Amino acid sequence: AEQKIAGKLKNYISEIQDSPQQLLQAFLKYKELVKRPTISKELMLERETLLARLVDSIKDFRLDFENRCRGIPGDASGPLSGKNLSEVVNSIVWVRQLELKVDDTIKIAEALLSDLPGFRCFHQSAKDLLDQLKLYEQEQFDDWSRDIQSGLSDSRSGLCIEASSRIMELDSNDGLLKVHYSDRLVILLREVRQLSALGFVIPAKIQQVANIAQKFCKQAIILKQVAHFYNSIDQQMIQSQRPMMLQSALAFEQIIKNSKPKELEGYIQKLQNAAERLATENRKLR
Amino acid sequence: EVEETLKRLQSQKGVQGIIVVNTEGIPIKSTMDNPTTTQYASLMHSFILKARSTVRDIDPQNDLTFLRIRSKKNEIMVAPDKDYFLIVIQNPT
Amino acid sequence: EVEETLKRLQSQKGVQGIIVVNTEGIPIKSTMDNPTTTQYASLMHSFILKARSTVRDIDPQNDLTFLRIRSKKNEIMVAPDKDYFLIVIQNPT
Amino acid sequence: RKAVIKNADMSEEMQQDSVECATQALEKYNIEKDIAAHIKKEFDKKYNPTWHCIVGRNFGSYVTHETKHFIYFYLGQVAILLFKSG
Amino acid sequence: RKAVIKNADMSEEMQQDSVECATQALEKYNIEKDIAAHIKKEFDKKYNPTWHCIVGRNFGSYVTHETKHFIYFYLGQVAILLFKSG
Amino acid sequence: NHVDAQVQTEAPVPVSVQPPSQYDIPRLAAFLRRVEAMVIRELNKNWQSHAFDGFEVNWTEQQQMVSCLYTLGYPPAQAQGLHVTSISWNSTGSVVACAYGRLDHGDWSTLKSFVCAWNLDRRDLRPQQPSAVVEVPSAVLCLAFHPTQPSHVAGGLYSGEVLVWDLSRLEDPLLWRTGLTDDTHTDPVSQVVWLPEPGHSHRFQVLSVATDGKVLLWQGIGVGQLQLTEGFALVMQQLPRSTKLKKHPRGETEVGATAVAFSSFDPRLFILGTEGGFPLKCSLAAGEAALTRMPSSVPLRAPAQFTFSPHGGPIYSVSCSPFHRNLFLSAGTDGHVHLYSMLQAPPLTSLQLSLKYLFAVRWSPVRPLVFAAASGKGDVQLFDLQKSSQKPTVLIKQTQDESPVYCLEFNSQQTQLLAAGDAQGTVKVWQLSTEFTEQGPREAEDLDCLAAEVAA
Amino acid sequence: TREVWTQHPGESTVVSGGSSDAVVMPKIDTPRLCSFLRAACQVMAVLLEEDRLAAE
């Protein structure tokens, strides 16, 4: 029965033979047949052919890592880019995709191909590559552990927040409006969440700052709409253009100068009435 | 009495459709869902009004008794009388 | 070739109608007088346009391939394409 | 047929004339060509020129019209649009 | 929505403008009165007034028009009528 | 004197099935006796007949290849080197619309952003000139077009606001928006779907999904303001899960998400894709309160009631079949596309489509067995699952420099069109070969057989 | 002034109207349309032969 089945298998394998993806995916779909000893002896050149495809695939995965491992995050010479991920989060996702393909290559070769003399030589190489991916990822997490804890110490930059630190500030040295919640803390909530969602353990200190930063994140995004509206309506006007809009802006600017939860949310409610007026007049000058 | 004949028509070789429609344009029970039944009953009612005119327009002393439509998905059958018309659909063979 | 095939259809038991139509309701081959040929051609062209529309309203992913029309005096058969169509007419069976 | 009506500017005789002229055409003819044809031809015959007619199960429109002459109305499943300009 | 047409009397610039304005009406609206409102409003603005426009997928019509001004066309599964009278 | 008038035909009334006792049922029985005598003869002849063996008819030109000539871009956006991923097609099939925002490192979007609309029917169409343009002071990345009104398009922002435009009033193109309230998103948003108003289903509401792990349903009232009425959170402990997932960390953490697809025959059922790499099944009726710390005017609940087998990392697209209620496709960071049935936790099929990252998946509006996918190498691909079980049927190279490509949408009514968008601030529109454009023999039966083949 | 009637859907491809043919030159002559008569008459002939085999 196997001999007649193996004739049809060897025919189907010969139809797909041009593509290494189709060959590997057929060897997955019919793996339990290819395991059996007489069928394994009937398909010996096809086993050596898949070994050659997988050995070249391990060369290509290591060559891609050798170029990328010290290249710039997201750039075509470095780790690939997903939607809205950070430098570290792109780097981790990219490394785990290399691990996944090297690990699947090892597992499929182990069941199907492990009689062959080349399989011992190349299994050692593929396992060693997979351990080098683990080790280099761990070196990135050791650097991340130091560098997040040292960054979090600089709360005055906005990398961490005291609740008794300032909401928003009209810095009279610049005339600009500033919000003390750093852009890096908004990235830290994305980072800690995406790490948790994929399955990482989060350090206690990082979780404590993330708790403070979560509730403040709602407020900080409101405060950044106000701050960017003020900084952009200021930059739209050279002093030759200002005093006329400055009368309407003086209602909104009284609330901004009063920066010098219930206080802030009542302040925001008044500020949204002033924003209907000011945003309508901003469009008129544009 | 009637529902047993509907099972007899549902049982046919390569077939899955029944709709009966009344001369006022309103459908009776079907093995299709109500969205599909409404769509088929209304559309084919308009098409059969044109069909019965077309045969009478060729000869006012003639009248119409059966119709077929074959299509890329399926064949459709139509059979009208005084108070009712039937739709049947046969899967492609 | 084709004319002999129209003569073959013209000779069959209880058959006499053959018309070919230009998709402007006007005929290009006939075994019938031109006035009656134009009556059947224009009526069937209207009826094909409503048939194809009806199949696309029934299922926009489907399309028409054949039409058959049975009357107490005769049966009519219709085979359509984008550019051109055939009508054939026969006594009942 | 059942008659249902909404948006208009004409004297009541002209509203009733549109309903009757359409009803009589719908009995006389099965094809919308002859319905719209008869509605214009009777309006041009009784009234002064110039008239335009639409007869459909689905339409929307924007048009210019002369004061005391516009109507839109339904007779069963079919709607009719009838206006004077020219 | 690709176009299919059979009628002929307007200058070629007016044929171009009428299909283009109706195309812009298809980005502007689906509710057919508003599609026809765009088409008519631009024709009344560029050309000499007054214009009439209708948009429908199940209608018949009979209408009269000034020389060198009429068009009727299908866009996809919908039909459009545009003419000057008055 | 002259006045201008507007009139409209109202929507059609739906017909109803009638119960039997109301009529003279013996006349239906006598009719069925006469008609069954003929219909028995005629259905046996039609089952028997050879009359259509190899018979065919044509209604279109047989175009031999997937082929294109369009290039859509806004030069003021392109001069800044901005990236694009959004496509939507309007209800009249006239407009394709597009949105510019850099996703490149997720970096803080105080940068300019544009929404662009092209009406491809225009004889006044030009490559470098949108039919309409609107600006936003932070990155926009969604569009969805309203299911009836063609001018109406809804989109989500970087920093969490939702905006709704009406392109029928281009001097004031934009007023329906959240502002900011306790109801809102905060982290980057990208999904929109339009959903009918419960009990008032000729009206529509905007749905939004975000890297927050919130799902929100919105409506507009008055100047510059949206109001909310359904709210869900992906609180990580609460959802039911498959055995590849460990005992989850703090439930006060959400799992972020961006996909939506609805099972089109039963509108309670939607599918979500996650930052955690697992697809979810979700119901618009799941009542379990979320216990999220943050306030909202309507309290948050778990949206989900099932978890499917995971991808190798984050998911960025999901789509549901318009032909079989149970089926969806997913695409993610691992170079693979998977098919699932909403009855079973394993994938019905898995395919690898690149060595690099992917994100698009869509089903053909015409063909039950056609799906399309798009790739960060700069390519678009189409698969005909009636022609092969393993090999992609068409591959298309969109960027000549191999800069990243990610969008797919199929046109609403010119169903021969598929459009795709890319990192060089551009969208291109592809017309498919006729084999994609028109439905094959027995494809609905073959899709039922495909789902049945590994019913397990 | 000129008068016009016009419809959707049409009663033919003569979609609008006012108050041998050139189209025949391609339509009669085209070898593809001549082949569609070979096919359509073959369908008619097997339908007639099936109806005679049922009748006789």
Numbering used by the authors:
A (entry chain B): 395 to 654, 668 to 693
B (entry chain H), C (entry chain G): 3 to 95
D (entry chain I), E (entry chain J): 4 to 89
F (entry chain D): 81 to 536
G (entry chain C): 551 to 569, 575 to 611
Sentences from the paper on this structure:
Dynein-2 is a large multiprotein complex that powers retrograde intraflagellar transport (IFT) of cargoes within cilia/flagella, but the molecular mechanism underlying this function is still emerging. Distinctively, dynein-2 contains two identical force-generating heavy chains that interact with two different intermediate chains (WDR34 and WDR60). Dynein-2 is the essential motor for retrograde intraflagellar transport (IFT), the conserved process in which polymeric IFT “trains” translocate cargoes along the ciliary microtubules. A 3.9 Å resolution structure shows how WDR34 and WDR60 use surprisingly different interactions to engage equivalent sites of the two heavy chains.
The WDR34 and WDR60 β-propeller domains each engage a copy of DYNC2H1, principally at bundles 3 and 4. Notably, a loop from bundle 3 of DYNC2H1 positions a lysine residue (K477) directly into the pore of the WDR34 β-propeller domain, whose mouth is lined by highly conserved residues (bottom row). In contrast, WDR34 uses a classic β-propeller mode interaction to engage DYNC2H1, accommodating a lysine side chain within its central pore. Lacking the insert in its third blade, the WDR34 β-propeller allows the associated copy of DYNC2H1 to adopt a bent conformation. In contrast, the copy of DYNC2H1 associated with WDR34 is bent. These straight and bent conformers of DYNC2H1 represent extreme ends of the range of heavy chain conformations observed in other dyneins. The only notable shared interaction that WDR34 and WDR60 use to engage DYNC2H1 involves E355 (WDR34)/D881 (WDR60) contacting R587 of DYNC2H1. DYNC2H1 mutation R587C is associated with severe short-rib thoracic dysplasia. The regions of WDR34 and WDR60 N-proximal to the β-propeller domains are held together by a tower of dimeric light chains (one DYNLRB1 homodimer and three DYNLL1 homodimers). Our data suggest that, in the case of WDR34, the binding of the IC and its associated light chains can partially stabilize the asymmetry of DYNC2H1, sufficient for a minimal level of attachment to anterograde IFT trains and transport into cilia in the absence of WDR60.
